[PDB]
Symmetry: D2
Subunit: 359 residues, 4 copies
């Protein structure tokens, strides 16, 4: 029900950074810098600007002290300065609230447009950014769990096909999705930069931010993050994983920051840059779709996500999903999942895999 505008879409390069509001800046710094080893581009009493090992733009993450923890903006870099004008014209045509700042909303970004998008999400588009020392060969700084790139965002939204269509018009190409035999869509992944995704839609009450994902070079780097969290005795902040994804084929881990913002660590998905890249649809009941090894998806993964803010700094109202619930149809009392389609052996009914029930 979101029409394709006459105005041309801005040419989006990739996800570039997220601005997260955090309640205790010191505790957040402890998590992102001391635990996760992100690199400080700038900090003061209000904000911490962080980047990954291979990044040359000013930052991939802004942490902003605020009264209520929430996503403040998810930023995409566009190809040219003129693409910021294109973004403004596009979202104006859609009837969305927009705000333009010629000198940026955060440090290290220039001319930028923020919008309350049709799904209620605060998107930023920008070209101009302050270049910093690209640390990609600074092996004197490299940590055993080094986060090397920002990879993607993931958004919770009640109507997946509605948001998918909107993002396709915006230029994202769908790479994978999860549906059932009766035509319900539960999740979709879509890209600009030639990886599996730059953002993704998870069916649920929204708008809420599901997670922000960073890449490592190798699988052992993700293992080290888990190991380090056990050593720091904060294993209760490991939410889910580590595992191999079905959708995306990436090795992964989900952890929780001090304000319960979910962060994914991700590596080794595949190239999607060709225009006829084959799309892959998984059945919702396929127990290898989210964790390839069949490990159960923790219930909080389906229920918990971050608030998002409007352009005034206020929390967006949550709209309830009316389509079927992935949690309910797979691990709920009347849910089921299979290892091999049509096989009772290795299937789970009314509970999760590996012998667990929902707590």
């Amino acid at each position: 029900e979101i029409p394709k505008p006459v105005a041309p879409a801005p040419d989006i390069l990739r996800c570039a950074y997220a601005e997260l509001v955090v309640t205790d800046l010191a505790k957040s710094r402890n998590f992102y810098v001391d635990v996760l080893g992100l690199h400080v581009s700038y900090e003061d009493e209000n904000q911490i600007y962080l980047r990954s090992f291979e990044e040359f733009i000013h930052h991939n993450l802004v942490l902003t002290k605020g009264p209520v923890a929430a996503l403040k903006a998810m930023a995409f870099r566009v190809r040219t300065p003129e693409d910021v004008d294109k973004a403004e014209a596009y979202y104006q045509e859609l009837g969305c609230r927009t705000e333009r700042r010629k000198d940026g909303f955060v440090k290290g970004i220039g001319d930028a447009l923020r919008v309350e998008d049709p799904l209620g999400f605060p998107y930023e588009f920008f070209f101009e950014t302050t270049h910093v020392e690209r640390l990609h060969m600074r092996y004197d700084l490299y940590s055993a769990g080094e986060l090397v790139r920002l990879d993607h965002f993931n958004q919770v939204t009640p109507d997946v096909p509605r948001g998918r269509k909107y993002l396709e018009d915006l230029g994202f190409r769908v790479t994978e999705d999860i549906q059932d035999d009766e035509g319900t869509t539960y999740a979709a992944w879509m890209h600009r930069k030639g990886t599996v995704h730059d953002t993704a839609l998870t069916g649920g009450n929204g708008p809420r931010l599901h997670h922000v994902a960073f890449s490592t070079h190798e699988k052992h780097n993700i293992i080290q993050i888990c190991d380090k969290m056990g050593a720091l005795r904060i294993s209760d902040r490991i939410e889910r994983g580590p595992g191999r994804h079905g959708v995306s084929n990436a090795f992964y881990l989900y952890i929780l920051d001090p304000d319960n913002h979910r962060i994914e660590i991700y590596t080794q998905d595949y190239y999607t840059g060709d225009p006829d890249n084959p799309t892959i649809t998984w059945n919702v009941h396929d127990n290898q779709r989210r964790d390839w090894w069949g490990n159960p998806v923790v219930p909080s993964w389906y229920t918990e996500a971050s608030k998002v803010l409007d352009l005034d700094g206020n929390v967006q109202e949550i709209i309830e999903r009316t389509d079927d619930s992935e949690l309910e149809v797979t691990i709920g009392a009347d849910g089921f999942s299979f290892t091999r389609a049509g096989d009772e052996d290795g299937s789970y009914h009314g509970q999760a895999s590996k012998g667990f029930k929902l707590g």
Copy 2:
């Protein structure tokens, strides 16, 4: 209490091989050869003899066709031919049933002694064995999931302290254990070869065999086994993991063979060869003790294990544990576990970690 014999203990080098009775030989071959990549030393219509990548003795695993799936023998290599005589005298003094075969019980083993030990387990002791091509540099054969060494056995027995004393007198040294503050021992690990263990005791109804473990070179090799099992659509045969252990500090995975014999894949524990190697005791309520990342221990891991045979080839009667159950005290309805000792935050009452309950 099992008395310490006057006869000297045999000098045991290491665990060497296990003989498992299996019901369908071809199906077992698929698992151990096609899925796991173990190397065939010899096979016929009745048995398959298998060895790991770096082994020079004839085999690390014998699969024997039989009516009832069970452990037939856990075999330990001894230092000299004379240590077989020492083993016979020692077990005779213990009042155990023993059987001596100068030409072995299985192919590729010479003079051998099998015993029904004081815990009801069929142990074998041998020195003589047919050497085979050591494949340790045969990288033309090397699998992405290559199993490189046999590492240990793990035994389920109802009275851990009783068994621990007997194994210590036999010359095994305890490296780690799990106890509570009320005097109960739930598990013990013990070695000869200078890794964390060659065998271990897990509290539970017994005698039953908990598992046999093989090691890989690197953590990615264990990940590959998981990935391959996903590709073969047999993820339902992944029981638990992959993870990082607390006890042993090893990276691990538990999988189930066609007869539900449990196999662990293991890597990167530490050196224990010094005689004053510090013994580590974990509290049973410590949620980082079995999985360091705090992932829940699947209930089947605590309840399921293989039958074992006596020397007549009949299943040993099972004696029920009367000591407290690790399952019940940690993940049962009256259970408890913590992330940080003395912290209510990150503790679990009457359920498992990460949002699950007993299925």
Copy 3:
């Protein structure tokens, strides 16, 4: 010297495949399939078509039996069917010989244009290709040394600035290069797909093909290839490496096929897709520019490369480089390199690093 056409450049997606003429098809099959584990998309008595683990187009490599080993075509996929017409007009304006086949030059490719480009190289441009099973999750087929993508080509040409300009007009963006203070350019790297490169120019006598490069997931995959070649007693076919590159930051290995075609295995370079991606220029005397650890560059690496064919199947005549030779200025009798610029300690004069002279 090469003027920019008024005709619009074809939109090039990425390098896609190379066709190499080989003298003994069975011996070449042994190397690419049995040693390297590439996947067969088609074969007969004259040709083998091969693809990497994550590929969905028909092939990344075609081996064609012929009398003289040579590069027959380096192919790039274009974005649309219409881009093939654009490519034809473009090279026609450049005065280049073109050949258009509506049904393709090799199996699994449709409408295609081959050209003898301004530097004498046989380029192919195509859109249409037969999709095949994408093996990216086929872990039951995954080799310990699995080649996962085709990454790039590398071309030897006598005048690097002349070639660079031509490739820039064609849409390729320079990411890194090697120069000296006197203004000679020795090599340049350039991309379309958002990695360090899709092709590269290496100063030397040309046209010759320096190498075709495939990527692995992890560094250990590359180490396995070396280990395997050791076990096969073909370590003499390991030309150079393994190492870490300075330029590109990739972990790497160079090996030689039966006809001495050079293959690079490559992993873990960085993202270059932003239009203002920072260009990196290294000094030719920096001993960390090619191997980051300062290991010496094998002289054959600088002197040997494959013949290339014209459109008639005849070898292209070679034109000698008149600019300074990288070998001569770094490892030759009158050459030098440094570890730290301006520091004589860790410098090498008239010989290579690590105590070696030219053989």
Copy 4:
């Protein structure tokens, strides 16, 4: 020939630590702590005591300030206090200078015996040592290049068979060696703890210490050390590697400390604990014996080694090797190596492999 004492050999557990005299304690600290990440057990302005990640004894390396860089002591831990008496009796019967100190020669070691051994080397034997925090699960401290264990020493001595016999009488078991077809032995490896070696003999002018080796968990940890040294622009202190060894099958790297003391980093050799462990002999001309991939051995690796001290703190006089030189017979002007025995193809005459001569 060194006679076999009537007195029993001390039961040696393993190599335990080395004491190296260094000329600038601060510069050595930067190398061993800052670059390499070893853990400080104790330090003052005269000495730094260092241990590996998984160690529980007080230290694996003592750096002692002094006027001439040299080995002061190579220490082996013995099984019981009584074994220190046995070692004293054993070396006294050998006619060797001994010194016994009930309170140790260095901090954190108790009753200890130091000897000037028959080959001129300062050996220490001890049981008593101060236990420290075993850091094996301190992943909060874990470096991307983490050194996890002390693995072995390597000694340069002119007469290898002479030394080998002495070490065998002492209880070391030979695992691998290098010989030629004319009866010359160039090197031998021997163990107590069940890895390939605890010490080794390299033929050359001696006594000199060739190197001390530390283990990592995985091959990428060794890669990271190289990468870090490149980032620190100290790649000139990488002497040789990284590589795969033929002998030992271990992945390796050799680096040089501020006083040119050689340190090897080493991982993933095999189990040798069985008393009939198959002994492997390589031919000296086999180009895969030292580097399995055929990479050339740096001439400094054959010529350079550390001074060793006597018990009075004076440099031991060097005795020249009269047997053939491994350098000369393989990579010298009159040397030879092969890839495949008997095959001229892939062989090297009067030069090193991969296109190099000696600089």
